[PDB]
Scaffold this active site. Structure first.
Site: not given
Ligand SMILES: Nc1ncnc2c1ncn2[C@@H]1O[C@H](COP(=O)(O)OP(=O)(O)O)[C@@H](O)[C@H]1O
Ligand SMILES: [Mg+2]
Ligand SMILES: Nc1ncnc2c1ncn2[C@@H]1O[C@H](COP(=O)(O)OP(=O)(O)O)[C@@H](O)[C@H]1O
Ligand SMILES: Nc1ncnc2c1ncn2[C@@H]1O[C@H](COP(=O)(O)OP(=O)(O)O)[C@@H](O)[C@H]1O
Ligand SMILES: Nc1ncnc2c1ncn2[C@@H]1O[C@H](COP(=O)(O)OP(=O)(O)O)[C@@H](O)[C@H]1O
Ligand SMILES: [Mg+2]
Ligand SMILES: [Mg+2]
Ligand SMILES: [Mg+2]
Ligand SMILES: [Mg+2]
Lengths: 144, 50, 106, 537, 524, 536
Positions: F57, F90-91, F394
């Site tokens: 996170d 958040t990232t 989340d």
């Molecule tokens: N199965 C998937 N295939 C391709 N891209 C993904 C998949 N799952 C999540 N993403 C991409 O990952 C990005 C953010 O991932 P994550 O780090 O889990 O979320 P956060 O931004 O909350 O940290 C999103 O922009 C999303 O498009």
């Molecule tokens: Mg995420």
């Protein structure tokens, strides 16, 4: 001095971190590797309170030793978890985790992604569970 | 293969991907590694490459 | 503005630059100090001084000569040094007047 | 100030680019320019009070506590223990003016400081410092041409020396020696004209010996057409005066000859020993006999001699000086018309010099003696003997007379003359203003600034003379423009008239041109700097 | 990242590895470029650096500035090195080379962060560099007429351009004429030691001068030197490596005599040795005498009596220049002083130059040497003047050897950027991006010119990009008009080798820095 | 100081401070870049004492870090705000803010005025929001419940509950639908943070439990009390059951010893009577925020009831809302007496004390008057359990957003590629310098798929070029508009229709990410000077 993070904030990253974690885990394993089985030998641990602990118990040993590597901390924590849950296997679990990480080190050096390794590990875990439940046998708990 | 910029204790800079040169300019202190480096330098002396 | 009282100091650590009133002040005070020192030796009823050096030899002189007195003192005021050299040059030119020239200048 | 590098990395890893970057400093851009301008203004405002007849002096104290009172801008800035690099540049600028001219060392600094002070306001309005420097160059060219235009010429002949004496009096008006104004001007003029190569238009200052001796009065300073030496006759029973002196100048010590090569003379018998003894005796006698047979009544050696030679000179009525330095030996030769002889065998009646008077001079209650050589026929060398009540006024008299000699030299090099009292600066400021009016590009502002900077010298003269700067300068500028007369300046001495041609206030055209050129070039070099890097502590 | 009982390397070894290390190298190079950016072009500024001793250096020269910066970063040392290499091979373009290299690195920084293989990046860099170099060699203007007036116009224009960035830009026509006369009066080797540069504090830039001959400062005269004359109107000149004074005939020599007659004979023999040397020099007809070795007071006075001129301890370089100018040879022996070994000039003089005394040999028609005499109000003023003149002289030499001229003000950079954009739009698409980045990087020269001048580099670069695609190759920044102009007609000329070597060196530095993937600092 | 300005501190000005701010922001973003997308990896954080934290996170990471630079604290607070208002992204928001800063400082170095860059960023943000809302959304009504499951699985990818998403997403969706409640205004509300999340190392992740009811991190007060009750009548009390002490302004002053005994016994009989009143209605389970003396616990034991003390106020509020009970701060009615009505009781089909690995907790199962949900996470240690808790939070926030706003967008850089294309085409119309600013905004948006591919260890250049080609074809050819749904497949390094693959994100995630990132970039870009005062 114009820093972004406070001094004393050291950040490592990459295959150095991966191999370091795996080495810390397998070191925790090597600590108690010889305390497994019927022909094990005792270890004399010295507490900070002048006490002594003469044992063969994996969780006793790992609970009496102190570490600073977070991977070793995590391994000691999973030993505590095993002891609290079932109360046995506290060093079989450590040795198995160490060996699994050791064999994953290979694939990590060979450009495989950790998520791929993890998905394989989870598939294998489910199939281990299936196989154990298949090979198990029942017990008549009334048979003292 | 990518180059390395090794700086020795004399603040001299070496930019190369020559293994024997990199080994020479590193301060290898573990004896077994020293032995492997001795082998590498003997290879450099005998053949010049490898 | 000024050499000393400027946002940038233009000098090496240990230097200094006294401006108009400060300079005239230190100059007048040094010269008048020299003069007040060397008078009371002036005239027939003038009295002598003890020089009493402070070196490891601790020389001891009892003098009424203004040139001798000024030569044998540790002066650090530039205007005072000017008056001292003036009295020395008087003592070189003639042999008398070394206290009167200093008192007159002061 | 600011540091060389302040990142340390976008990844947390060490970022070391320059050695001791944490201890090092840096100033960049307009703040750097303003720091430079502030330093230069500080130096210039220090110096501007030492400008003109009513200018005051500065008391410099060195590391060991020796005192120097002076009005000379070059000497002041050399004695000044500056740490700022722009102040060091201004010291170099003044030193350059002194090297090239020997006068103007304070005008250059004041003018450069004023130019930078005006560039300060120009930079505030947003003009590029290079554009400022180029406008300053343009205005400097205009001012130089206007100086060439309004210049006058003086006669540098040896018959009527009044113009040269007026120039030297103008140069020496601001110095402590203005108590003997005309005496000092007269002796500077007579000195350079006695020793000056008119055909080559060169003046070798090694031929002018400026000697000072505490005692006496400043009015006792005089010009000796000849030489003065800090020695006395070798024997105390020799005569202290020699008239119609035929002088033998010698660089051979009156001692038995000696090879330069490593030599060993071997004595192997009583006969060898006695032969050596007689050889020594006869060598001494032969030396003295050669000097006498040459017809000389006086000897001057460079390397000293021993008891036998001294007494033989005394017996043979040959007054003699010993341990005279190489430069003074050369000056004595040049003055007396004699040739320097390396050994007695090479001495002849034609190689001798002639001086109508050689005397030993006392200085009161001192025990120190000096030797005057004068009444030569056509001495191409000369000595200025300075007297005074203290070494401070003696040293200031020396440097002031050096300024006067350098000014007469500049006249001999170029006879063209502009009139001072700020009049030339006001006229060049008017010309620069006119050219800026005719200039339609953005350099108009830089040229107007150059004019306002040129006008700081008349303002400084007025201020040091107690008059109101703006009033006096505007009135004399208005008079210059109305009645065309570039000789209208500041009545620093309160003679009533503003006409410097009538007050006989006189400058050298090359001097003023050099002032303007040096100030402009150094201001350009300073405005071109926009980044300073310096080591910590 | 775990402790070991015995560690592989010495304790204190700092190893930076990977994409972060590479990006940090690029950032350090950006810093090094920033350190010299503001010196570029006619509106460029000077830098003041101060050493630990407290002596300041003021310079517009990028090589000088970077030598003075105590750079220690292993990757940023490479920019300093290539600036040195440019100053060596060409003598101008030292700021441009660093700017170009750092801009290449900056332009490829995004792909490096996104994991583009450095081998791919360096391959693209090599390709684009070869293309740009061949394009410069192709479109460089080389007048094939070998006309002398046109070749002097060419040299003067290239020198004026090379000088239109210094503190002598307001006298660049003057100094360019002087530099051109100098290199055109040099011999085939165009030796730099054959151009003398004296720095006499005091005087104006326009008061500086070039002497078609040789000149050097007076050297510690003894007594009688003022009795010597100081002007000769057709002198013959004896150039010697001979110590003329009473001295031990040899250091391992020991005289042994047992007779006062022999003693006196030996004394007179030393004197006769010296006097015979002097008499040979006098009978050779030479009225001027120069020695690499001391000339004593006795010899000085001898020559003064013979109405000759003597100067000892003359520096070796000034002696060699006097030789190349007057046309003689330097003699360790005075036993064969023939007219073939004596030198000759139409005028010899000793004059005053700003507080110093200088000997002038003028009128040498066979002179393959010249001496600059530079005036100015400060040591560093004259030093930066000398550096500017060195830039101009090296430019003129290279132009003499290859008069192939391109235009400046960024004209050539914009032309090459256009050509490389065109080429990149015709290739698969991976090398396309990198060669387009090369092209966009080439635009740093006109951009930095406009920046240092105080314009809108964006609008000016738009104008230039447009005008170079419509047909027109010598359009670049016009500084005094805050616009663009045909710089080949405005006479902003630049030898082609300048930009050729600039591109070569910058691309090599970029390829090196990008090929480095790890830095290992050993403890001292 | 050395300068004329006499401020007692340091002063950075111009490109120096702009580059410094960008360096700080880049540092913060490079910390978290490696934890983005299904191929991102977790981080350890050690708190100078051996306290370890595993996490993916970005908000958690930036909260735990100790940041010194203000331009980096800005981005840390930005991530915190994204976590508060959305719960995911958040990232990505930090990465995008940093990239916007990078490109904007590049423009300012090229001497485009920062006001113009800011105007262009504002325009590009507005138009990107509009273009998303008009072209890139999918209706969760058109897609059904597998849309919710896919959104949960997409949120859980990149977490330590990723591959197990097939089952954790079912749990999350069931839980949010369970805690669904409609209030006045008839609007459906999904109040997450009312799902209880407990952690207990032990059995594998797959052994985590969804409790139809409520789970309490508490135990009975006395070992003589029962530990299971079936027809649970529940009494929620906000007061303590202890020996009664007279309040501060009341003193006992005896002058007749015969009263002392009765007073002392009354001090306990008061609470005894209150407990009897409570128990007479049928309450067999009594939860209390306050304490319960042993004297009282004995009353409960003898009654055969289950009493629980030191319950948390929020747990009590949730149990009350879920079971139908009324939290009482006092047994006091509108008649000036003390009574307890059976209407103040709650109900549950069972209340049990269940044994979790080495602890014990209470489970309230099948509460009536509303459905509630709790989740007991089971992992290998506290590190795993905490990261599972954060990941599950989340996912719950994501499902909540999907159910509140019924629009989703595809993932895998689909939105970022489409916006890059559309905005680089749209910049041509708006001014001349704002045009460059909008083009740079577009190019900055590409940092998300670039980072995804880099972490996947794939050719980011080639992949993002293919993506941009697809989306340009979609925006120039009306017959292939279905290409909008194409994004990265990081398990194969090949573009893919993410709407058909099931990679969905709530529209609010991308919209709020963009808005907040733009606001952060604008505030940091507006700074052209810095005065750092020496502390006192
Ligand atoms: N199965 C998937 N295939 C391709 N891209 C993904 C998949 N799952 C999540 N993403 C991409 O990952 C990005 C953010 O991932 P994550 O780090 O889990 O979320 P956060 O931004 O909350 O940290 C999103 O922009 C999303 O498009
Ligand atoms: Mg995420
Ligand atoms: N007998 C005297 N009667 C009056 N005045 C005297 C007498 N003797 C000396 N003086 C005065 O005293 C002064 C000399 O004092 P002295 O201590 O010698 O001073 P200085 O050292 O300056 O000469 C002279 O000015 C002189 O006029
Ligand atoms: N008698 C005078 N009346 C008016 N102006 C004078 C007089 N003498 C000198 N000046 C002016 O004073 C200015 C400053 O010269 P000064 O300070 O004496 O020499 P320097 O500038 O070399 O130190 C000169 O420009 C000159 O014109
Ligand atoms: N008069 C001019 N007008 C426009 N551009 C010029 C002019 N003179 C030089 N330049 C440009 O300035 C650039 C760099 O100048 P300079 O600072 O002398 O180079 P360096 O510092 O690299 O030796 C050159 O590329 C040249 O094209
Ligand atoms: Mg067991
Ligand atoms: Mg090989
Ligand atoms: Mg003067
Ligand atoms: Mg150049």
């Amino acid at each position: 001095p114009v820093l972004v993070l406070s001094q004393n904030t050291k950040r490592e990253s990459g295959r150095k971190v991966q191999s370091g974690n795996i080495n810390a885990a397998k070191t925790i394993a090597d600590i108690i590797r010889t305390c497994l089985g019927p022909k094990s030998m005792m270890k004399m641990l010295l507490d900070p309170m002048g006490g002594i602990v003469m044992t063969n118990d994996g969780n006793a040993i790992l609970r009496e030793i102190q570490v600073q590597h977070p991977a070793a901390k995590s391994m000691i924590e999973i030993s505590r978890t095993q002891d609290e849950e079932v109360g046995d296997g506290t060093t079989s679990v450590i040795i198995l985790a160490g060996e699994m990480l050791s064999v994953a080190e290979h694939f990590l050096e060979q450009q495989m992604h950790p998520t791929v390794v993890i998905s394989a590990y989870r598939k294998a875990l489910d199939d281990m569970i299936s196989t154990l439940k298949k090979i198990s046998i029942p017990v008549d708990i009334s048979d003292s | 293969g990518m180059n390395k910029m090794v700086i020795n204790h004399l603040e001299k800079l070496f930019v190369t991907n020559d293994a024997a040169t990199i080994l020479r300019e590193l301060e290898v202190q573990h004896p077994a590694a020293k032995m492997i480096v001795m082998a590498s330098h003997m290879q450099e002396q005998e053949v010049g490459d490898g | 503005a000024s050499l000393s009282l400027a946002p940038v100091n233009i000098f090496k650590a240990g230097a200094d630059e006294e401006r108009a009133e400060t300079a005239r002040l230190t100059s007048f005070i040094g010269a008048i100090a020299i003069g007040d020192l060397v008078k009371s030796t002036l005239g027939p009823k003038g009295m002598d001084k003890i020089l009493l050096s402070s070196g490891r030899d601790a020389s001891l002189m009892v003098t009424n000569d203004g040139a001798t007195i000024l030569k044998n003192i540790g002066v650090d005021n530039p205007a005072a040094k000017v008056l001292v050299d003036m009295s020395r040059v008087q003592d070189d030119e003639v042999g008398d007047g070394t206290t009167s020239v200093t008192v007159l200048a002061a | 100030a600011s540091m060389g590098t302040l990142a340390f990395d976008e990844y947390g890893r060490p970022f070391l680019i320059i050695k001791d970057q944490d201890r090092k400093s840096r100033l960049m851009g307009l703040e750097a320019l303003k720091s430079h301008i502030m330093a230069a203004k500080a130096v210039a405002n220090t110096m501007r009070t030492s400008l003109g007849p009513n200018g005051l002096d500065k008391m410099m104290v060195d590391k060991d506590g020796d005192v120097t009172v002076t009005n000379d801008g070059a000497t002041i800035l050399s004695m000044m223990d500056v740490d700022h690099q722009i102040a060091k540049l201004m010291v170099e600028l003044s030193k350059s003016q002194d090297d090239e001219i020997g006068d103007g060392t304070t005008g250059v600094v004041v003018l450069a400081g004023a130019l930078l002070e005006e560039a300060e306001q120009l930079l505030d309005r947003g003009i590029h410092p290079i554009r400022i420097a180029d406008g300053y160059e343009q205005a400097a060219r205009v001012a130089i041409e206007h100086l060439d235009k309004i210049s006058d010429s003086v006669l540098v002949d040896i018959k009527d020396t009044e113009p040269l004496i007026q120039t030297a009096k103008t140069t020496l008006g601001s110095k402590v020696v203005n108590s003997c104004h005309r005496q000092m001007a007269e002796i500077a003029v007579n000195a350079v004209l006695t020793v000056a190569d008119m055909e080559r238009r060169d003046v070798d200052f090694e031929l002018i010996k400026v000697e000072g001796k505490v005692g006496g009065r400043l009015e006792d300073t005089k010009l000796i057409k000849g030489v003065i030496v800090d020695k006395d006759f070798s024997h105390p029973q020799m005569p202290k005066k020699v008239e119609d002196a035929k002088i033998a100048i010698l660089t051979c010590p009156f001692e038995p000859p000696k090879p330069k090569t490593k030599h060993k003379l071997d004595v192997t018998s009583v006969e060898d020993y006695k032969a050596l003894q007689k050889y020594e005796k006869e060598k001494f006698e032969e030396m003295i006999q050669q000097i006498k047979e040459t017809g000389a009544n006086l000897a001057i050696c460079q390397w000293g001699f021993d008891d036998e030679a001294n007494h033989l000179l005394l017996q043979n009525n040959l007054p003699a000086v010993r341990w005279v330095g190489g430069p003074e030996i050369e000056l004595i030769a040049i003055a007396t018309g004699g040739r320097i002889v390396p050994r007695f065998s090479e001495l002849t009646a034609e190689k001798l010099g002639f001086a109508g008077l050689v005397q030993e001079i006392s200085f009161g209650t001192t025990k120190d003696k000096m030797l005057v050589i004068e009444q030569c026929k056509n001495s191409r060398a000369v000595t200025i003997f300075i007297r005074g009540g203290n070494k401070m006024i003696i040293e200031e008299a020396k440097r002031s007379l050096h300024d006067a000699l350098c000014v007469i030299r500049n006249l001999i090099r170029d006879n063209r003359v502009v009139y001072g009292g700020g009049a030339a600066e006001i006229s060049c400021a008017l010309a620069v203003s006119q050219e800026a009016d005719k200039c339609p590009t953005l350099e108009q502002y830089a040229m107007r600034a150059f004019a306002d900077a040129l006008e700081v010298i008349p303002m400084a003269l007025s201020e040091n003379s107690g008059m109101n700067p703006i009033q006096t300068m505007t009135e004399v500028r208005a008079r210059q423009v109305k009645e065309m007369n570039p000789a209208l300046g500041i009545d620093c001495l309160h003679k009533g008239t503003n006409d410097m041609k009538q007050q006989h206030v006189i400058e050298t055209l090359i001097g003023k041109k050099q002032q303007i050129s040096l100030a402009t070039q150094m201001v350009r070099m300073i405005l071109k700097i926009d980044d300073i890097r310096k080591p910590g502590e | 990242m775990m402790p070991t009982p015995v560690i592989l390397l010495k304790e204190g070894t700092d190893s930076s590895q990977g994409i972060p290390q590479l990006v940090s190298n690029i950032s350090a190079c950006q810093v090094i470029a920033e350190a010299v950016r503001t010196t570029l072009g006619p509106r460029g500024m000077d830098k003041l650096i101060v050493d630990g001793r407290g002596k300041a250096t003021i310079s517009n020269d990028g090589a000088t500035i970077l030598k003075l910066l105590d750079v220690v970063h292993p990757a940023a040392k490479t920019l300093v090195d290539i600036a040195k290499s440019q100053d060596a091979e060409v003598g101008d373009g030292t700021t441009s080379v660093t700017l170009l290299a750092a801009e290449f690195l900056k332009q490829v920084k995004p792909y490096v962060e996104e994991g583009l293989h450095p081998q791919i990046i360096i391959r693209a860099f090599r390709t684009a560099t070869q293309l740009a170099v061949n394009k410069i060699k192709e479109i460089a203007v080389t007048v094939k007429k070998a006309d002398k007036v046109e070749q002097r116009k060419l040299l003067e224009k290239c020198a004026m351009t090379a000088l239109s960035s210094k503190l002598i830009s307001q006298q660049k026509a003057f100094f360019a004429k002087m530099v051109v006369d100098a290199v055109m009066m040099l011999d085939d080797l165009l030796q730099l030691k054959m151009i003398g540069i004296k720095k006499v504090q005091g005087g104006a830039l326009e008061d500086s001068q070039l002497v078609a001959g040789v000149a050097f400062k007076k050297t510690f005269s003894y007594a009688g030197f003022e009795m010597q004359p100081k002007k000769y109107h057709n002198p013959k000149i004896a150039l010697l490596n001979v110590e003329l004074e009473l001295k031990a005939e040899k250091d391992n020599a020991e005289i042994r005599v047992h007779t006062v007659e022999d003693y006196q004979a030996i004394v007179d023999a030393e004197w006769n040795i010296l006097y015979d040397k002097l008499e040979k020099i006098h009978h050779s007809g030479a009225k001027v005498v120069l020695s690499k070795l001391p000339i004593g007071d006795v010899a000085t006075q001898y020559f003064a009596d013979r109405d000759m001129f003597c100067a000892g301890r003359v520096p070796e370089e000034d002696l060699k220049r006097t030789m190349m100018a007057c046309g003689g040879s330097i003699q360790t022996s005075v036993n064969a002083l023939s007219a073939d070994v004596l030198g000759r000039c139409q005028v010899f003089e000793e004059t005053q130059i700003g507080g110093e005394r200088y000997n002038f040999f003028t009128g040498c028609p066979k002179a393959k040497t010249c001496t600059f005499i530079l005036r100015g109000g400060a040591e560093q003023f004259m030093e930066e003047t000398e550096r500017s003149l060195h830039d101009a002289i090296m430019i003129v030499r290279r132009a003499i050897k290859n008069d192939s001229v391109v235009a400046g003000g960024g004209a050539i950079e914009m032309e090459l950027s256009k050509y490389l954009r065109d080429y990149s739009r015709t290739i698969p698409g991976k090398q396309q991006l990198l060669i387009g980045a090369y092209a966009k990087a080439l635009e740093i020269i006109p951009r930095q010119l406009c920046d240092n001048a105080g314009f809108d580099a964006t609008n000016i670069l738009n104008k230039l990009r447009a005008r170079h695609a419509q047909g027109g190759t010598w359009y670049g920044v016009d500084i005094n008009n805050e616009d663009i102009a045909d710089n080949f007609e405005a006479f902003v000329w630049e030898p082609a080798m300048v930009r050729i070597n600039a591109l070569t060196a910058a691309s090599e530095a970029a390829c090196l820095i990008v090929s480095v993937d790890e830095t290992i600092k050993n403890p001292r | 100081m050395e300068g004329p300005l006499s401020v007692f501190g340091d002063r950075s000005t111009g490109e120096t401070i702009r580059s410094q701010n960008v360096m700080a922001a880049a540092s913060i973003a490079n910390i978290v870049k490696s934890s983005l997308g299904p191929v991102g990896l977790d981080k350890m954080l050690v708190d100078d004492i051996g306290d370890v934290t595993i996490t993916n996170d970005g908000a958690t990471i930036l909260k735990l870090l100790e940041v010194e630079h203000p331009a980096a604290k800005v981005l840390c607070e930005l991530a915190d705000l994204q976590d508060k208002e959305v719960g995911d992204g958040t990232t990505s928001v930090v990465i995008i803010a940093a990239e916007l800063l990078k490109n904007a400082d590049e423009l300012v170095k090229q001497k485009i005025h920062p006001t113009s860059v800011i105007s262009g960023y504002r325009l590009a943000c507005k138009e990107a929001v509009r273009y998303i809302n008009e072209n890139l959304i999918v209706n969760t009504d058109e897609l059904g419940r597998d849309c919710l499951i896919n959104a949960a699985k997409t949120s859980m990818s990149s977490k330590i509950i990723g591959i197990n998403g097939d089952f954790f997403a079912n749990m999350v969706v069931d839980a949010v639908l369970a805690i669904k409640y409609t209030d006045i205004r008839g609007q459906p509300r999904y109040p997450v943070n009312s799902v209880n999340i407990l952690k207990a190392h032990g059995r594998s992740q797959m052994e985590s439990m969804l409790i139809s009811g409520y789970a309490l991190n508490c135990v009975v007060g006395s070992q003589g009390m029962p530990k299971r009750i079936v027809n649970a009548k529940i009494a929620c009390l906000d007061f303590s059951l202890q020996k009664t002490k007279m309040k501060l302004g009341v003193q006992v002053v005896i002058t007749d010893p015969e009263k002392l005994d009765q007073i002392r016994q009354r001090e306990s009989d008061i609470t005894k009577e209150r407990i009897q009143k409570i128990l007479a209605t049928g309450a067999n389970v009594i939860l209390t925020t306050g304490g319960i003396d042993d004297m009282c616990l004995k009353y409960f034991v003898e009654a055969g009831a289950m009493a629980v003390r030191r319950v948390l106020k929020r747990d009590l509020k949730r149990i009350a809302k879920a079971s139908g009970a009324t939290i009482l701060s006092t047994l006091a009615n509108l008649e000036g007496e003390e009574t307890f009505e059976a209407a103040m009781l709650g109900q549950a089909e069972e209340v049990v004390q269940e044994r979790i690995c080495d602890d014990e907790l209470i489970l309230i199962k099948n509460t009536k008057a509303r459905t509630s949900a709790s989740i007991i996470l089971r992992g290998a240690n506290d590190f795993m359990c905490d990261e599972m808790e954060r990941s599950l939070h989340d996912a719950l926030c994501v499902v909540k957003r999907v159910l509140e706003s019924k629009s989703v967008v595809p993932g895998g850089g689909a939105v970022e590629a489409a916006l890059s294309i559309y905005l680089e085409n749209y910049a041509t119309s708006m001014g001349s310098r704002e045009q460059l600013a909008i083009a740079e905004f577009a190019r900055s948006l590409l940092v998300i798929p670039n980072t995804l591919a880099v972490n996947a260890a794939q050719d980011s250049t080639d992949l993002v070029a293919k993506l941009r080609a697809f989306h340009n074809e979609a925006q120039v050819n009306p017959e292939r508009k279905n290409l909008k749904w194409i994004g990265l497949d990081l398990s194969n390094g090949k573009p893919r229709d993410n709407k058909q693959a099931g990679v969905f994100e709530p529209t609010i995630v991308k919209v709020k990410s963009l808005k907040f990132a733009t606001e952060a970039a604008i505030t940091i870009l507006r700074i052209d000077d810095l005065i750092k005062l020496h502390p006192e």
